[PDB]
Write a protein that holds these residues in place. Structure first.
Motif, PDB file in Angstrom:
ATOM      1  N   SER A 132      -6.930  10.406   0.073  1.00  0.00           N
ATOM      2  CA  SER A 132      -5.596  10.003   0.513  1.00  0.00           C
ATOM      3  C   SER A 132      -5.621   8.718   1.327  1.00  0.00           C
ATOM      4  CB  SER A 132      -4.930  11.122   1.330  1.00  0.00           C
ATOM      5  OG  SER A 132      -3.559  10.817   1.587  1.00  0.00           O
ATOM      6  N   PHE A 133      -6.675   8.505   2.105  1.00  0.00           N
ATOM      7  CA  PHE A 133      -6.758   7.329   2.946  1.00  0.00           C
ATOM      8  C   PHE A 133      -7.275   6.102   2.211  1.00  0.00           C
ATOM      9  CE2 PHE A 133      -5.752   8.845   7.158  1.00  0.00           C
ATOM     10  CZ  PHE A 133      -5.772  10.234   6.943  1.00  0.00           C
ATOM     11  N   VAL A 166       6.748   9.274   0.159  1.00  0.00           N
ATOM     12  CA  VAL A 166       5.868   9.357   1.324  1.00  0.00           C
ATOM     13  C   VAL A 166       4.866  10.490   1.191  1.00  0.00           C
ATOM     14  CG1 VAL A 166       5.812   9.570   3.816  1.00  0.00           C
ATOM     15  CG2 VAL A 166       7.658   8.249   2.714  1.00  0.00           C
ATOM     16  N   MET A 207       0.432   6.498  -6.953  1.00  0.00           N
ATOM     17  CA  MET A 207      -0.580   7.555  -7.069  1.00  0.00           C
ATOM     18  C   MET A 207       0.046   8.945  -7.017  1.00  0.00           C
ATOM     19  SD  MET A 207      -4.089   8.194  -4.859  1.00  0.00           S
ATOM     20  CE  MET A 207      -3.274   9.314  -3.753  1.00  0.00           C
ATOM     21  N   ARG A 232       0.627   4.166  -2.838  1.00  0.00           N
ATOM     22  CA  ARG A 232       0.686   5.606  -2.596  1.00  0.00           C
ATOM     23  C   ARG A 232       1.769   6.273  -3.432  1.00  0.00           C
ATOM     24  NH1 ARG A 232      -0.928   9.408   0.992  1.00  0.00           N
ATOM     25  NH2 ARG A 232       0.513  10.986   1.695  1.00  0.00           N
ATOM     26  N   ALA A 286       0.804  -1.217   0.000  1.00  0.00           N
ATOM     27  CA  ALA A 286       0.000   0.000   0.000  1.00  0.00           C
ATOM     28  C   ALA A 286       0.839   1.270   0.000  1.00  0.00           C
ATOM     29  CB  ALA A 286      -0.934  -0.024   1.197  1.00  0.00           C
ATOM     30  N   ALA A 287       2.052   1.216   0.539  1.00  0.00           N
ATOM     31  CA  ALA A 287       3.006   2.302   0.379  1.00  0.00           C
ATOM     32  C   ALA A 287       3.434   2.500  -1.069  1.00  0.00           C
ATOM     33  CB  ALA A 287       4.196   2.053   1.287  1.00  0.00           C
ATOM     34  N   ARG A 289       2.264  -1.296  14.757  1.00  0.00           N
ATOM     35  CA  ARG A 289       3.517  -2.046  14.540  1.00  0.00           C
ATOM     36  C   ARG A 289       4.243  -2.419  15.830  1.00  0.00           C
ATOM     37  NH1 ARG A 289       4.104   2.418  11.360  1.00  0.00           N
ATOM     38  NH2 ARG A 289       3.020   2.198   9.356  1.00  0.00           N
ATOM     39  N   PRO A 293      -2.020   3.382  10.583  1.00  0.00           N
ATOM     40  CA  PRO A 293      -3.296   2.945   9.999  1.00  0.00           C
ATOM     41  C   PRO A 293      -4.227   2.434  11.090  1.00  0.00           C
ATOM     42  CG  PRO A 293      -1.604   1.296   9.592  1.00  0.00           C
ATOM     43  CD  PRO A 293      -0.903   2.494  10.222  1.00  0.00           C
ATOM     44  N   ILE A 298      -3.920   4.707   6.336  1.00  0.00           N
ATOM     45  CA  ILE A 298      -2.939   5.431   5.560  1.00  0.00           C
ATOM     46  C   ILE A 298      -1.594   4.713   5.683  1.00  0.00           C
ATOM     47  CG2 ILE A 298      -2.435   7.044   7.446  1.00  0.00           C
ATOM     48  CD1 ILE A 298      -2.394   7.926   3.677  1.00  0.00           C
ATOM     49  N   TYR A 299      -0.901   4.553   4.552  1.00  0.00           N
ATOM     50  CA  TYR A 299       0.228   3.618   4.481  1.00  0.00           C
ATOM     51  C   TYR A 299       1.459   4.317   3.930  1.00  0.00           C
ATOM     52  CZ  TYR A 299      -3.455   0.185   5.232  1.00  0.00           C
ATOM     53  OH  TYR A 299      -4.511  -0.555   5.763  1.00  0.00           O
ATOM     54  N   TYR A 300       2.402   4.618   4.803  1.00  0.00           N
ATOM     55  CA  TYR A 300       3.707   5.181   4.475  1.00  0.00           C
ATOM     56  C   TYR A 300       4.613   4.915   5.669  1.00  0.00           C
ATOM     57  CZ  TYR A 300       1.973   9.235   7.177  1.00  0.00           C
ATOM     58  OH  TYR A 300       1.428  10.049   8.157  1.00  0.00           O
ATOM     59  N   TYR A 301       5.910   5.134   5.484  1.00  0.00           N
ATOM     60  CA  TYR A 301       6.831   4.820   6.584  1.00  0.00           C
ATOM     61  C   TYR A 301       6.466   5.639   7.817  1.00  0.00           C
ATOM     62  CZ  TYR A 301      11.100   4.743   9.371  1.00  0.00           C
ATOM     63  OH  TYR A 301      12.014   4.636  10.397  1.00  0.00           O
ATOM     64  N   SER A 344      -8.127   0.880  -1.210  1.00  0.00           N
ATOM     65  CA  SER A 344      -7.018   1.798  -1.035  1.00  0.00           C
ATOM     66  C   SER A 344      -7.312   3.141  -1.692  1.00  0.00           C
ATOM     67  CB  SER A 344      -5.729   1.187  -1.595  1.00  0.00           C
ATOM     68  OG  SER A 344      -5.679   1.361  -3.010  1.00  0.00           O
ATOM     69  N   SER A 345      -6.361   4.057  -1.545  1.00  0.00           N
ATOM     70  CA  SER A 345      -6.422   5.303  -2.289  1.00  0.00           C
ATOM     71  C   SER A 345      -6.442   5.001  -3.782  1.00  0.00           C
ATOM     72  CB  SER A 345      -5.222   6.193  -1.931  1.00  0.00           C
ATOM     73  OG  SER A 345      -3.999   5.527  -2.237  1.00  0.00           O
TER      74      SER A 345
END
Lengths: 8, 304, 59, 227, 339, 233
Positions: free
Chosen positions: F30-31, E89, D15, D12, D8-9, F177, F106, F99-102, F51-52
């Motif tokens: 975005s989410f 990100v 996108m 993103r 999912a990252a 996490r 979520p 929402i999925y990023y480093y 997903s987005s």
């Protein structure tokens, strides 16, 4: 004989 | 007789020049990655098409024409004639695409920046290749290696395209005479004619403003000379295109409509030179589009 | 003071402030930079290569 | 291999990629222009006139004939332009405003240097920066009507002895001013475009459109191997 | 008094400073490290090529996690990258495309951007709305923001085209201290690791060391012949490198008050665009107008290596806090990660 | 930030109903969005994810094909068109943003939920063997969870989540996490684990800490919850 040519 | 010697000389010369020229174009354009403009992308595609034209036409025309016998097999006949037709089709369509690019760039210079981009140039390349492959599929089907016997009792073979019926052979070579000549040639004349008109109206406007909608320009004489040289190059392009391709496509129309009378008159040496001119197009193109251009010459000095 | 010489007087104040600062010899500045380079040579993944398991970018 | 969260990252990321490409499309279909001029060159009134004619940094968007023009006035930068003028290395033109009234004005604030000679020095420095080898220059010689006044009161030969033309004629003087600016370009392949304008004249946005059209024609000549 | 007094005392004090320095010049660095074994060739490979910027990358900053980095391009985006996974990100649509500086807050909670707009735009990364928004428009400078660097979530030091630096309170959106004393357009900041000092280079070819809290310019370093485009502290805070348009780096020591070493070569006519130190201080990495980065032995000034993967001017160069990788951003829009 | 679910109620089995929720106060496009359901006396169950950009849609095997998840990003509204509804579909349904990023969190915000009444496997098993703990304020209590697979992925993330359903309200993310406290979580919570065994240590317990505690894994779809340890005052 050989009368002709290839198209290209 | 003298014709074999001059055939061998001129075929050897234009082969060597076409191989050297197009390999120089390729190595320059793959080495200078900042140089791959949309135009240079088309020039790369055209140089590949012309190297393939050279390598898979010229020997397979000359040797069977010197030897009056197709010494290769039916599979070679299929492959060769397919790559011939494909390389002619792609060379033609890439010339058309460069013509419509230049038409956009000069005559619709802002509106073309909406669409003239490397992604578009690749899409048009992929379309012109895939279309040329598809349309040329009759060649590797119906190019039967029809056999015969010479004046001696040895049997011999000749690679020839024989679509099933005389009307079908006429339809095919008329469709080819439209889509690979008249339509390319009219589109090229329209493109380079509207460009020539635009540049000449600019020359006239600058001269009349020098006598004290287009705009006041501090043009140097070098810019007028450059615009004239562009006009001359565009006329040279159109003329050399008609000189290279009207002979072969006219000969093929004659063979399609009056087969016996055409082959009687053109077989052997005459068609060998008609084809030599056709492949001379593959040498003229890398000259006009690459070696004439100062930037590509500078990349050649900047590279191997 | 709020006078037409202030841009010069303030500069003199700053340059006399800079004059009065205590200074260490370049011998000891250099010895300090050597001592820090030595003590951190192991803690520098660029001064030496580092194995592909320890390097998060090698994967 | 990637987990559900790393997938999912990546999604993103892709996108964001497609948003970046769509803003690339938008940012490329817009021709950036850099508006420069001396003090009292009339940037405010000139832009206001384009704004009524249209249907520390100010971007004025203009949209003409389906083409969008991003006229960058860099405003009152109290900064050494050599350190940021390379931001505009990509612009299609410098728009340079010079007021033709400036020949009679000397720098009242500092010394007595001609207001036109400072404008000349700025034009020379902009046109000679290496960033602007590919950009043209568009030179708007504004306030021709104030020159049409001053010529009756302050003769141009007194301020520039190189003027060979008559003292009566506005045309010969503004022709001389244009010559005195066009002479500054050593890069004779670089076309300077110039217009004589007034705050009355609505045509200036059409002139900008067509000068930028000519610059893009020149660039497309270079990019497409037409000499 | 008069210029026949004050501007002669200034000369006497400058001469006294130079005399005190030359008295401190016991032995050049190159003599003391003549016995230090060289670092050899520092061969490094492009481990990542972050593709997705479309215009010139102008600045970058590693986050303290040594994994995320923001980068600013004149397409009007900040991109935050996971350097481990090539993932974007965030991409922040900026009000002004004309970015020239970029900072990551050491917590990761904020990023800053600045440009020809005289604003350092503090963007909040951790909203509950899950979009980045501008938390503050710090709008009190009057020339372009050349460098922004966070001291903490509440404090950022900023450098402008106006010759001043300014320390800001982000919460109250106002300058808490203005640092006045450069004469040239001031170009680059680096905060010291203790965050009690920072050093700034300006077009006057001087570097000034500032007390964030007092506001005083403790020291002025002058050895460059032209503008200091780039500045970085040596990671102990006792020295800093200064990259200039003179195509030299110089190492200045905060307590020698003096130039320790110069990094120069005849082949190097191009200016330095960025400098950063390896975590041990032993390598100084310089970006150039030439499409390369050179890795210098900071102790011995041998060119240990060259990073040559760029096809345009290298604009920014950061080494991670953990030293694990070097990022290099360039005017070809590519941000290449090296180790 | 708001999610308000609506269009629940009572349906006859075999019927179909579109329950929906509308987002406000956040960039919904975005989410990514999850549906998580809760049967009237049972633990959480993940239903679907979108997903987005409406990519990488996923469902649980219990709802695959029979349910479809969609979003109208311009209207910032999510729709779950259920079909072939069954007695086992009776649940409270929650919109859960993600929402999925480093370093993201979520499952951080959970909508108030909507009740659906119906008139009437390599899926990671999660075990919370202690279903109840008697707790007194000020005590320290150490909730523990076990998974039929190690959640330590090769990238070093233990994809484990903790949720607190304070009694009578929607679940709230405590830990993501394995060892990051969510926004606004009291620092008295802490998480730890070996990758295959995990423990939540609620130091200095408060009456706001009583409720049902769910561990969840986010290594593989289907996303799976423990039965939930209830803390009883």
């Amino acid at each position: 004989d050989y009368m002709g040519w290839m198209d290209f | 007789e003298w014709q074999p010697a001059v055939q061998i000389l001129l075929y050897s010369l234009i082969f060597l020049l076409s191989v050297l020229g197009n390999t120089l174009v390729i190595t320059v354009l793959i080495r200078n990655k900042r140089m791959r403009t949309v135009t240079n992308i088309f020039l790369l595609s055209l140089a590949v098409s012309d190297l393939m034209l050279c390598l898979f036409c010229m020997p397979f025309n000359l040797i069977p024409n010197l030897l009056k016998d197709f010494i290769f097999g039916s599979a070679v006949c299929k492959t060769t004639t397919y790559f011939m037709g494909t390389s002619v089709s792609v060379s033609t369509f890439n010339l058309v695409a460069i013509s419509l690019e230049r038409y956009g760039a000069i005559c619709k210079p802002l509106q073309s920046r909406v669409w003239q981009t490397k992604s578009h140039a690749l899409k048009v390349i992929a379309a012109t290749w895939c279309l040329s492959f598809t349309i040329m599929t009759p060649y590797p089907i119906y190019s039967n290696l029809v056999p015969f016997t010479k004046n001696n009792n040895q049997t011999a073979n000749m690679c020839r395209f024989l679509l099933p019926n005389d009307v079908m052979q006429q339809s095919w070579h008329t469709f080819l005479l439209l889509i690979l000549f008249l339509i390319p040639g009219i589109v090229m004349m329209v493109a380079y004619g509207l460009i020539s008109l635009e540049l000449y109206q600019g020359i006239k406007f600058e001269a009349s403003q020098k006598k004290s909608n287009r705009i006041r320009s501090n043009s140097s004489a070098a810019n007028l000379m450059a615009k004239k040289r562009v006009i001359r190059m565009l006329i040279v392009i159109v003329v050399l295109f008609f000189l290279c391709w009207m002979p072969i496509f006219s000969a093929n129309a004659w063979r399609a409509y009056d087969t016996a009378s055409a082959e009687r008159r053109l077989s052997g040496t005459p068609i060998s030179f008609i084809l030599l001119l056709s492949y001379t197009s593959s040498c003229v193109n890398p000259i006009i589009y690459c070696f004439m251009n100062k930037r590509f010459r500078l990349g050649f000095m900047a590279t191997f | 003071n709020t006078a037409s010489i202030a841009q010069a007087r303030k500069l003199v104040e700053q340059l006399k402030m800079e004059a009065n600062i205590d200074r260490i010899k370049v011998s000891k500045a250099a010895a300090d930079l050597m001592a820090y380079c030595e003590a951190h040579a192991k803690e520098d993944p660029l001064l030496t290569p580092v194995p592909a398991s320890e390097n998060p970018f090698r994967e | 291999t990637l987990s559900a969260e790393d997938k999912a990252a990546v999604e993103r990321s892709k996108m964001i990629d497609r948003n970046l490409r769509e803003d690339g499309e938008k940012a490329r279909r817009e021709l950036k222009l850099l508006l420069l001029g001396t003090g009292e060159s009339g940037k405010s009134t000139f832009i206001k006139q384009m704004r009524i004619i249209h249907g520390g940094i100010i971007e004025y968007p203009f949209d003409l004939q389906s083409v969008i023009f991003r006229m960058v006035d860099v405003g009152a930068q109290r900064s050494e332009r050599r350190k940021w003028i390379h931001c505009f290395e990509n612009v299609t033109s410098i728009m340079f405003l010079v007021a033709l009234s400036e020949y009679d004005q000397v720098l009242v604030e500092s010394d007595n240097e001609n207001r036109m000679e400072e404008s000349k020095a700025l034009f020379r420095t902009i046109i000679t920066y290496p960033w602007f080898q590919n950009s043209s220059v568009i030179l708007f010689l504004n306030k021709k009507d104030l020159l049409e006044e001053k010529i009756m009161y302050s003769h141009l030969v007194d301020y520039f002895p190189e003027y060979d033309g008559p003292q009566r004629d506005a045309q010969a003087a503004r022709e001389f001013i244009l010559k005195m600016f066009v002479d500054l370009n050593p890069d004779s392949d670089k076309i300077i475009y110039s217009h004589f304008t007034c705050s009355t004249d609505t045509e200036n946005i059409r002139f900008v459109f067509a000068a930028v059209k000519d610059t893009i024609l020149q660039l497309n000549l270079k990019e497409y191997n037409l000499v | 008094s008069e210029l026949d007094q004050l501007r002669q005392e200034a000369e006497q004090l400058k001469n006294q400073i130079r005399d005190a320095r030359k008295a401190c010049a016991d032995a050049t660095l190159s003599q003391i490290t003549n016995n230090i074994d060289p670092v050899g060739r520092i061969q490094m490979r492009t481990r990542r090529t972050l593709r997705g910027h479309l215009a010139k990358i102008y600045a970058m900053h590693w986050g303290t996690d040594s994994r995320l980095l923001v980068s600013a391009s004149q397409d009007g985006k900040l991109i935050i990258w996971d350097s481990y996974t090539t993932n974007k990100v965030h991409a922040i649509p900026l009000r002004s495309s004309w970015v020239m500086t970029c900072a990551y807050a050491p917590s990761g909670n904020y990023v800053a951007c600045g440009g020809l707009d005289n604003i350092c735009s503090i963007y909040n990364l951790k909203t509950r709305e899950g979009n980045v928004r501008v938390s503050r428009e710090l709008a009190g400078h009057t020339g372009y923001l050349s460098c922004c660097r966070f001291l903490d979530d509440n404090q950022i030091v900023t450098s402008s085209g106006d010759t001043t630096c300014a320390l800001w309170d982000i919460e109250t959106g106002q300058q808490t201290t203005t640092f006045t004393g450069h004469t040239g357009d001031v170009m680059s900041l680096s905060l010291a690791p203790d965050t009690r000092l920072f050093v700034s280079g300006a077009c006057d070819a001087s570097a000034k060391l500032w007390d964030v809290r007092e506001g005083m310019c403790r020291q002025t370093f002058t050895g460059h012949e032209s503008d200091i485009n780039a500045i970085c502290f040596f990671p102990n805070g006792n020295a800093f490198a200064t990259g200039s348009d003179d195509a030299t780096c110089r190492l200045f020591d905060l307590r020698a008050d003096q130039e320790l070493m110069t990094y120069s070569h005849d082949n190097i006519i191009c200016g330095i665009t960025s400098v950063s130190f390896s975590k041990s201080g032993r390598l100084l990495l310089a970006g150039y107008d030439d499409f390369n980065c050179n890795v210098w032995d900071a102790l011995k000034a041998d060119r240990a290596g060259v990073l040559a993967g760029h096809d345009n001017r290298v604009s920014c160069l950061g080494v991670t806090d953990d030293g694990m990788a070097v990022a290099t951003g360039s005017w070809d829009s590519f941000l290449k990660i090296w180790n | 930030v708001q999610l308000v679910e609506s269009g629940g109620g009572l349906v006859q089995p075999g019927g179909s109903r579109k329950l929906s929720c509308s987002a406000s106060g956040f960039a919904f496009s975005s989410f990514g969005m999850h549906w998580v359901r809760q049967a009237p006396e049972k633990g959480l169950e993940w239903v679907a994810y979108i997903s987005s950009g409406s990519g990488t849609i996923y469902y649980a095997d219990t709802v695959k094909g029979r349910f479809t998840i969609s979003r109208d990003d311009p209207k910032n509204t999510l729709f779950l068109q259920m079909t072939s509804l069954r007695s086992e579909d009776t649940a409270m349904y929650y919109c859960v943003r993600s929402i999925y990023y480093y370093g993201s969190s979520p499952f951080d915000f959970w909508g108030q939920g909507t009740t659906l009444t119906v008139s009437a496997s390599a899926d990671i098993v999660m075990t919370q063997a202690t279903s109840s703990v008697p707790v007194t304020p000020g005590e320290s209590v150490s909730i523990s969870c076990r998974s039929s697979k190690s959640l330590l992925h090769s990238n070093g993330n233990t994809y484990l989540y903790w949720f607190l359903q304070r009694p009578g309200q929607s679940p709230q993310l405590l830990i993501y996490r394995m060892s990051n406290l969510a926004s606004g979580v009291p620092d008295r919570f802490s998480g730890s684990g070996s990758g295959t065994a995990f423990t939540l240590t609620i130091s200095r317990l408060e009456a706001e800490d009583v409720g049902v505690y769910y561990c969840m894994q986010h290594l593989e779809y289907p996303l799976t919850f423990g039965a939930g340890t209830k803390l009883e005052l």
